[PDB]
Design an enzyme around this catalytic site. Structure first.
Site, short mmCIF file in Angstrom:
data_model
loop_
_atom_site.label_atom_id
_atom_site.label_comp_id
_atom_site.label_asym_id
_atom_site.label_seq_id
_atom_site.Cartn_x
_atom_site.Cartn_y
_atom_site.Cartn_z
N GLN A 142 38.86 47.13 46.08
CA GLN A 142 40.00 47.91 46.06
C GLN A 142 40.45 48.32 47.29
O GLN A 142 41.30 48.20 47.84
CB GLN A 142 39.82 49.29 45.22
N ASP B 296 33.21 34.97 42.07
CA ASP B 296 33.62 36.60 42.07
C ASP B 296 35.24 36.36 41.55
O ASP B 296 36.18 36.10 42.29
CB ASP B 296 33.77 36.99 43.65
N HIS C 262 30.58 39.48 43.10
CA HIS C 262 31.31 40.71 43.58
C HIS C 262 30.49 41.46 44.40
O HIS C 262 31.08 42.41 45.36
CB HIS C 262 32.15 41.25 42.38
#
Ligand SMILES: *[P@@](=O)(CCCCCC)OCC
Length: 197
Positions: free
Chosen positions: A105, A159, A172
């Site tokens: 994020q 990922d 990830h």
């Protein structure tokens, strides 16, 4: 360790030559999370403890997992926070070379912030590293309005967030080696490219 506020705590009469602004991933601690400290340590080795200021994006950036689903991959409040830090760097230390980074994020946040930034400040960011870039497919591996040569994306095979999904799979969580070597290597090279050595 996981919290660094060198820019906010820093004395403008004694500005560092390099300022690094980093955004952590979802649910991570402090303002640097799991990867930030590794990058910070290597930057300090290269520029000296007083030569570089490490600043994590804290404040309004709560790194809430659900915010990955919002239009820009993060909240408007978080973007405002990171933009504010870039603005504080530009005001406090106008001659410092900036570098940036983000994970998950935080990578979407770094990309959104840089895209919205005033060009005069954006142009001072010598290099940006993104790990597990959630908008990798959507943005074609780029940060809008920012040069490709100053951008380095670390997206592991497998990922899923790098291929347009928001599913979190094992790859990830495997950016440790990149944060310890190639990521700081890239940032150091980009800073020296413009500052000399
Ligand atoms: P990243 O924000 C996680 C992947 C985002 C997609 C999940 C919806 O941070 C990892 C801690």
């Amino acid at each position: 360790r996981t919290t660094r506020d060198d820019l906010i705590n820093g004395n403008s009469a004694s500005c560092a030559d390099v300022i690094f602004i980093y955004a952590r991933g979802s649910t991570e601690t402090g303002n640097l999370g799991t990867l930030g400290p590794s990058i910070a340590s290597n930057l300090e080795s290269a520029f000296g403890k007083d030569g570089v200021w490490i600043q994590g994006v804290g404040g309004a950036y709560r790194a809430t997992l659900g915010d990955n689903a919002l239009p820009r991959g993060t909240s408007s409040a978080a973007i405002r926070e990171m933009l504010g830090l870039f603005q504080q760097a530009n005001t406090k230390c106008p001659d410092a070379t900036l570098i940036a980074g983000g994970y998950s994020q935080g990578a979407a946040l770094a990309a959104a912030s840089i895209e919205d930034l005033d060009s005069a400040i954006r142009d001072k960011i010598a290099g940006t590293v993104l790990f597990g870039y959630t908008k990798n497919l959507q943005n074609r591996g780029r940060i809008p309005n920012y040069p490709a040569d100053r951008t380095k994306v670390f997206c592991n095979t497998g990922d899923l967030v790098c291929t347009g999904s928001l599913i979190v799979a094992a790859p990830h969580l495997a950016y440790g080696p990149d944060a310890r070597g190639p990521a700081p290597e890239f940032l150091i090279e980009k800073v020296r490219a413009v500052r000399g050595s």
